[model samples]
Target: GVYDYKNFGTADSKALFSDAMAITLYSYHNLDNGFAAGYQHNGFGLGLPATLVTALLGGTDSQGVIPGIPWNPDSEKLALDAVKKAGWTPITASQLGYDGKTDARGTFFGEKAGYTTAQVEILGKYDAQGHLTEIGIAFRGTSGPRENLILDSIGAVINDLLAAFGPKDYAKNYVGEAFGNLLNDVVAFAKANGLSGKDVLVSGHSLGGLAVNSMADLSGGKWGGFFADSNYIAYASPTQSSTDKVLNVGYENDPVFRALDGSTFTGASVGVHDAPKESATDNIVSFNDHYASTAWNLLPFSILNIPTWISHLPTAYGDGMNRIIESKFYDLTSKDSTIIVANLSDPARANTWVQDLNRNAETHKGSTFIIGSDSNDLIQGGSGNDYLEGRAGNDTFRDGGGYNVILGGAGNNTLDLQKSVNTFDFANDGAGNLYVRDANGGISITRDIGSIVTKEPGFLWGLFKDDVTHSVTASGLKVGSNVTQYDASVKGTNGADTLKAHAGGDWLFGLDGNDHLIGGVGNDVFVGGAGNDLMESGGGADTFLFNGAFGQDRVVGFTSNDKLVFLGVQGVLPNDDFRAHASMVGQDTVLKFGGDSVTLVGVALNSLSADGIVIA
Candidate 1:
């Protein structure tokens, strides 16, 4: 087998990384799925060191501290000082970005750093002439995986070495490994997928995926899914050569993916990865601690070789059909779309970002935040205690069975509540907090409560303010029995409205065009009759009512202007009753119960006005 051949294959970019001549000439040499292209000049001649450095650093940890490559006397002195000042520590290959530690690197690490052994023999075979040959045909470099806490450990090491190794070393060590392994996987996957017979699907995760992608040229016309996820610092296949087939998925919150890789190089480059097919798929997905994060630990390098149809489905045992296909198809389909990041506590999903994930606080829903310019957007509803910020564009959100909150900004938005609201759900508890303040400057519970508490009580307290300056003072609330305990601190103009809610539950409403209402406790109701309303319900069951907008009837009470209120009020009140909803009790100007019979209970009849008629 040790033929004294002084030649391998011609060197070219593609040929350098993978010599087609070698593959063709030695196709039948062995059934093995691997091939060596020897050296091809292309731009890779300088990358020989690139490959070596990549492999060598693969042995180090997060801090890029290489035990085998310990510093020289001068370097050691610097390293020791740097370690103390920089808090330097060793990290594993996973942290350094070699793809996944579970892959071959696990064994590779042990060989390089751990107590693993390898035998080194002379390059020459026992030739008949015994004039020993100087070259070795086969070499095995392995490692035992090292566990690490950081995801950037491997990448940092490689990059650091590459910086010091220069282009020549880069060509030899870094580029060789990156290009070689990438070529190997591409060729292997191509054959397995029957590239000659059909289109091949090429995908990758982390570094391995980054490497194989550079070999896209070898795939020819076949490359169904040229995918990559959170790759470290590897370059992407020059899409200029093959643009039609390449998909790079990046995570929005995952900072580790900031390094250059795939269609996009460094994370900050605006248009670098801006191409729809080259950008991140789930940009909004957070980088939680490993398992806690959705796609953090997945190894797409090996999976990239799998058929697209099979790899894109949910493998949860007896799962349904095409789930994976539909998911990946749409995911790749929408690579050009934009994602907005927002909080669940926000009542409505802002239009800033498409992907919104609320890790906690069920005040909103995540699904309402996704916007689809072309493909179906995904809304990963993070946790049960979450809120759904309503969206304006057409989008899809994950509506897991649980209490979800959401708000639609302005466009034609759709919402999907996977789980129905429960009666006892305190997340958006009923109208238990509402408040009201009269023209005379006296504040009282316009709600069903017997008497008004002067000062804001700890429970469902409402704050009544001066109509002119819109300020809170001791005058409005009669806290203590006494002395007109209400102190008027600020005032609101005749057209200016004041909103007030304290402690627990309260609703503040504006009576007339600009009359301000304040709820001290319980659910609250607010109605802005004819003017543009600025409504804010601090606590309790709060409701903001504006008759009807654009001639449309009020979704809340007798909407006259613009109504922004709570849901399910139709069930609580009779058609003819003007008591408003339960939340309105503290905010409504006057409360009157009218049905087959007339009940004026829990009513504050300031006066008899024609507009006071509650539309039946």
Candidate 2:
């Protein structure tokens, strides 16, 4: 019995008004019958100028006129009286009439003089302490079976009118006289009662239900016309679309609720309550179940198996309405719940700083700072462990002295890890890109970016495949791929260090103290600075660089394929500029600089060549 509102139609409003109005409207069908002895079955006993309000509000069933069947009052009191009983006041009660003009059905059925009038009532709901809580407006459905037939005849001709004027206008025009008139009356009623448009709830059934949807279309002044904010609850109505508070109720086997014109109903928040239309006894279906009474009384039976002929009544829909409120039919999600990401690093905006999974976009900037940009921007981390994120757009990230993580979400970005003070934990993904992680364990992902710079060395991991151009520091580094430069050093206020290079052409050095410099695989230039240093050029054409005061260095990988190049020399050429011995104290070959020397472990002095010496 439960179906999506969008699958059928759309809208409704308050719990109390919708429930009471449905019962009161269906009670109209119980008038003038010997159903009840003392129950009122006459004109608006609760006070609207309606054709029949008492019997319906008193819960008289059309079939209750039969013997032995007790008359059940549709409601405890008339809708107007119900308002007063609830400590509220009925403000306006009137009849909405159509123009006395004759169409094809109007001429055939009867003259339109007094035949085209319907009831419209407005009541104010107040809290127990006396402040207004909500306003209720009810539009009555057809008075009886004869009225339904007459309306049906007129409805046939109105179809063409609907096609010409549109469903948006047709409901207000034919049912409520005019859409503006209906809206104006409600607005005026609210103003007169010292209430705003937001404090109103509208309810109706059948033809009145159609009018309810129409008035809702202009809710909140969303359209060109100005109307108050209000919620809508309709029953057994046609399909409608509006961006307003709406809940629609329908019967399971009621064809009237499902009748469509091939258009979809759209609303801000629309929900439908499709109650069981059939009873346990039989499976007979009829439009008569479209009445609101059926929706109320059929609660205890199986909704799926009940006869719609018995379920389409207002009673059935009223029962369904209670379930709707308890079930939170209209408490749906809204646009405010959607997610949106914006550029946070604009000068006019705030900076996004990431700490693990938490992102602080407002207050993370200082000397040892962490930061990021909302747009594709250029960000540089500070001296301490820092986290940077370029959430969107093409971005560039630069690392600082401490541990750092940089994330380039969706652009061709760059990661610069040229700072020597911090170790770079770099890894290359399957996409041939890089992600850098700092000491503090914060991580940043670089997607679709192909460039990385490791100026000064530390522990450089996962650079095994990239063809990089590195201006290395005197410190140690580990890499998997080739490089253009490799400058090593141990001269600072630091301890012993290791420098290792792999692939391509490299320039290696060991500046101070006891250091290890290994040129793994590439034509390289190696330098051993002050103090005893161990150096090795693994592959390709290699050269040994020596300068003044160059300490007692050892080239363990020296071979015929390698050269000894001198630096910072005075006079040009001559074997006198360099002292080479076939065999030195503890070296196979010793080449002297101004006051320093390089001891080659393998090559002899006799094989030394001028081509291997340089004066630069």
Candidate 3:
């Protein structure tokens, strides 16, 4: 409340840690770019008395010294101090960087697989009365320049390790042996205490994913082979050459996965899986976190792969996987495109979504903030709570779900509340800037109190056009005038205007000045006055009015149930006029009717039959 202490419990935070450690390979904490091309050359590669040091503890009732991890800080710091040979000032978990506690802290640096602060950390989860459930081990990913140089030499290292005896030998013999001893210790402790068997879950990201993959492959199922095949959960794991049920999770935007596994919303490499494809940018939400704070926005496209590197974080992977597993409780009803990570009573995520709003908004049906960018975007929210905005371009946003806000920015925007459940109504916050709220979704409800907050006072000609009255307002953009199988009349003007209607058969008069329009149920008419109007008429038996004078109008949901009504020309327009004009270009239909053109989208050319065309 008063102060925020790093809460690593949230999804994004977990991802942040995961991604940071993804590059956290065996030499993660170690500054050795030396062990490259499958050769042994580290400050601690040769040999030493490698004794497995295990700090078995009781539950909080007894393991209650350190605040965060409770009493295991010494386990990390003591070993850290022994091998912290300066170049980089070592850090303790509770201090910074390393926030929690560890068991077998570090043992892959200095001499004899020397124990150092940053080398590696084994975190064993224990219950009171000393009941160990699962043991977790971590291999840090590459970071800074030292590991970066190692990244440079990866060309050969990756190849040699493929032959086994490289890291499989190094990690299996040395690193695996250390864990072998510790795991042996824990297993010993558990047996003596008469407890059930425990398993070790070894995790790593990126290069960590790479080496560990080899480790697991070479050892056949160990931690690099000694550990169970299922125990290795690699995050942002490189799209490897081999496939197995290694339990690897690869995120969409992660450069490593993109490069190795092939980026697909539904792609899997062996056990390596592809995270949800919600606009690869969804993973880029890490810009809100430390691991991703700089790259995505600041870094140029693919330079250094740094731009994409931002998405490759274990944090992104973690956030994505978490969203998938626990998603049902969150009620992901829409199952639609683009989802902003929103959770209940979250300390970081809900807040982290400020940018995520636009992040998800810029690409969905319902987005909250048009905080940045000035492009004509189409944003719609999934079944999640939303705050939508259309910053500049002539954008369209409809009420998707949750407490909604259709904040219209500079561009003329349109909002659809037909599907909006419960109550979705409009409001003017003193500034006359309109905003609509909601009571809409799969469930039913009453009390329409929703708003699409607007920037231009000329927003909605008349909020909810429940009747058919052609009362054109100052905006020239007629909004909310609906007629039932009854009637609905909403019109736009010479300026960039926008209009929207409900389930009734509606008529739109966005005659000129580039307009955006949408029609709900029944038979609806969209008259593209004389300007390029973008419209989506999804009702049954819908008609789009077009003429030579009317500019290019784009129909969103152009379908079989929709008709193209060409406002006839004055001359004896040849019967071939409509025939020659309407043709298919690729999947879309381009209707060059005289001086104006009407582009039909979503519904391809073949889907547009003669019955779908008419001369009004």
Best by lDDT, which number? 2
The alpha-carbon RMSD values of the candidates against the true structure, listed in the order shown, are: 24.2, 29.4, 18.5
> Residue by residue across 196-308, what tens digits does model 1's lDDT show?
21122222222322323343333342332332211111112211213332333333332222233323233332111222233334333321222122343243211111111
What is candidate 3's local distance difference test score?
Answer: 0.39
Q: Is candidate 1 or candidate 3 better by TM-score?
A: 3
Q: Which stretches of model 2 miss by more than 4 angstroms? A: 1-89, 92-115, 129-131, 143-169, 175-185, 218-228, 242-245, 262-307, 324-616
- Candidate 2's TM-score reads 0.33
lDDT, candidate 2, 197-303, per-residue tens:
65666766655565566566546443233344555666665444344344444432443352333123322102222221121101112112112123433443221
Error of 1 at 265 (Å): 7.1
lDDT of 2 at 84: 60
RMSD of 2: 29.4
Q: Which of the two, 1 or 3, has more lDDT?
A: 3
Give, for candidate 2, the lowest lDDT window spanning 10 residues: 333-342
